[PDB]
Amino acid sequence: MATQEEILDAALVSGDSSQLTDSHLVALRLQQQVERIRQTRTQLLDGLYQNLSQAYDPGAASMWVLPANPDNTLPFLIGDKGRVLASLSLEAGGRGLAYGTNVLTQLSGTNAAHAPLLKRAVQWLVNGDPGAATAKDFKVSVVGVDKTAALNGLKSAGLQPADAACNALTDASCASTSKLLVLGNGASAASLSATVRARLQAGLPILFVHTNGWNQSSTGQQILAGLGLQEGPYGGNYWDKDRVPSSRTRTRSVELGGAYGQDPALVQQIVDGSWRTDYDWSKCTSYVGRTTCDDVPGLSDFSKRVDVLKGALDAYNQKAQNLFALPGTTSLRLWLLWADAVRQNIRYPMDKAADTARFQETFVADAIVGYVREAGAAQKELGSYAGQRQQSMPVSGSEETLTLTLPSAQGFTAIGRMAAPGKRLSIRIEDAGQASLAVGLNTQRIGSTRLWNTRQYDRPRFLKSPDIKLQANQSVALVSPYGGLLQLVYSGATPGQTVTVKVTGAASQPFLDIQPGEDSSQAIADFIQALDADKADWLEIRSGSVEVHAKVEKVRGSIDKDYGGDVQRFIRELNEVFIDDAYTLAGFAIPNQAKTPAIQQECAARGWDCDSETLHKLPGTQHINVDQYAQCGGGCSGNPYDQTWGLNPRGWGESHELGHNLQVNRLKVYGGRSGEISNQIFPLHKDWRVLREFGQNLDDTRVNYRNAYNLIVAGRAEADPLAGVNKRLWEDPGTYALNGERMAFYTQWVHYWADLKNDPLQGWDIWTLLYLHQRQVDKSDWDANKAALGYGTYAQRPGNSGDASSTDGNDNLLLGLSWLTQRDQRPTFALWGIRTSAAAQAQVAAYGFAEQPAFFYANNRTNEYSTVKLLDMSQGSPAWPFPLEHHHHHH
Ligand SMILES: [Zn+2]
């Protein structure tokens, strides 16, 4: 029925791009509109400038003042370095001008040359025409900046203003009689932004001067917002000292101001299809399978122009502003609808050489997504991100209420619902306390769109939305073209607080929400049933301080591969063998889980606090993304950390990487030298557990006892035996240097503790105890607790350096280990080439323990401790006591 022309016109009002498919049509309209704006700008600027001097130097002590909506705001003065030093506003049908410094008191000094242009700008403010004289004694209200100095400035520019002698900012009758309001940052008013806007809308011209030099100003920001302008970033003009030179021409300033925050060349390119056919892709590089193209000539400049558009639209997304409910946003509306229209046409996969036109146009459209609206369109093809299930997910007509717990002060947490593609969702938050909140969609890192890899432009570049700010008790309506996992983004929260999320129009992905310390068997059954229905492409799991955001087919693949399709057993292992294993090893205070009897008892014997939230609360969330692609490689560090293989509760990588989140500097030998070592206790512990509890032998050659021994025996023969071992074991700075040999130091203490306790099952408690000890060392009141912690001799809390040249880690390890074992461990530290400070050595001497003579635990397997052998290193070095497993040695 309706033509595309008709669909476009209605879409411009409503934001409803559902039926809009002709991108070329929208693009012609955008071209006309961008040309309207350039014509309107250039006539205004040309009228302002004429052949007057363009010289304007605001100095280092000044601020940049930027436009926002390109249809109604624009630069006035752009320096040679491209910084906007003053801007013009026609917002709300008004007239305003804003400068980054108080130019009015410089019109007889540094900026005498600017005075004639300033007079034309005032004529434009007062009369709407830069060549129309002001009346003699025209009434000017000056508020928030020195009145006499401002009025004298205007006089020295050849104007004849008279003091209005009333306040046109705060008094609406004064406004109606006044010809101009001049504002500075000393102003007082109720609802300053709205008040400025009201005056502007009513037809009072406004001239703002920034009065705080290179300092930012909240009052300044609020005035600018009322004008529809933007305070520049921190530091102002302090570094660049940008200025407009005397040599600047009318033509050039008209061109720069007409072009600012506009891209007619891009719009033409779109309209004509003139996408670049000859990028030199040979200049792309690849790194562990990911191709990037930063050095392809021309490409960065193009990508940065597309970033401008993305940044301009995302500024509205972030503040929860609906462009279609804001008057005079036509250019931006047209960009948004153009990109929605492209999205009806996208087809995957694309390749950077084979499909230059579709690839480049998509590259642009993907950058332009308006989330805050009452209606919109789904992208037709979701490629490697999702498919028909995501597209068809049902949504709730009624409002659902969700209670979320924030585990730390800052981060994000899964809400447990999705936006469905093209479907309006409404959301709000209540009972936030002092937490600052936003909503976001999806968790993908941008490297997981592999668009520069051959034929892998197969999903949107920006699956994760901007963070959309929320206010207590105010609803926001969203439509996403992709659908997505809703996240609650938070800062300034109180660990353990809750937030109430009310949402209407959301879909319900399979979501497993383990309730801390409560029975979960119903939640699991409900999750399994949701998976069985197979109505989603994405699922989430929240289990303790871990949240998993996962493509269903990837998780299904892991369950099918390693669990024979048994979703229950997979979940149990994920919760227990993976997650709980790690958090319990690190000794955190886990709801409704007591410490084991041996840990309980040792904590009482040491008289320690091993249970308070104050000291041992669970840390903030570690997120895991499971997807077809990762930020880097086939999996990548971070938070979230990314992986593409699935999700393996028994995996080495999963626990190694979780282990990074749980590292602490005071348990690292030589700082960064243990940056890939001290986290290894997590996967090692898990493998020890897996071999015992399941009979499966994983990664059984990780701990290189044999070569650690070789290096120790060779090193200790040197004149300085500690330095000799240090050189051989800890000196190499390579990321995974001597990884297996350094790990063997960490396990020494496990075998020692098992022997000391006379219980082969207790060995790993030493690491849980050191963790407990360290968090007290880190946060307990020093004078009151140092004796219990074995730090009696220290006037102050030790340092927390992670540097390889620091002894902070070595020292605390030496003290914790000596104190817990109740033996002086200096001789085994020396054996391993590990130096400690004089302070720490004195503390160990203070304990008055018997030395533990140097010792070394040797094994020819990592996971099976029953064969470990204890070597006395105190008088010499015995021969390595093992053959190699399943090996034929030389006769
Ligand atoms: Zn690592």
Short mmCIF file of C-alpha atoms and ligand atoms in Angstrom, two decimals, residues 656-657 660 675-676 679 736, ligand 1:
data_model
loop_
_atom_site.label_atom_id
_atom_site.label_comp_id
_atom_site.label_asym_id
_atom_site.label_seq_id
_atom_site.Cartn_x
_atom_site.Cartn_y
_atom_site.Cartn_z
CA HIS A 656 43.46 -19.79 34.90
CA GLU A 657 41.57 -16.76 33.76
CA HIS A 660 43.65 -13.66 37.33
CA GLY A 675 51.74 -12.63 37.05
CA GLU A 676 51.07 -15.97 35.19
CA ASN A 679 46.71 -17.55 39.49
CA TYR A 736 55.11 -17.22 30.37
ZN ZN B 1 47.15 -15.61 32.08
#
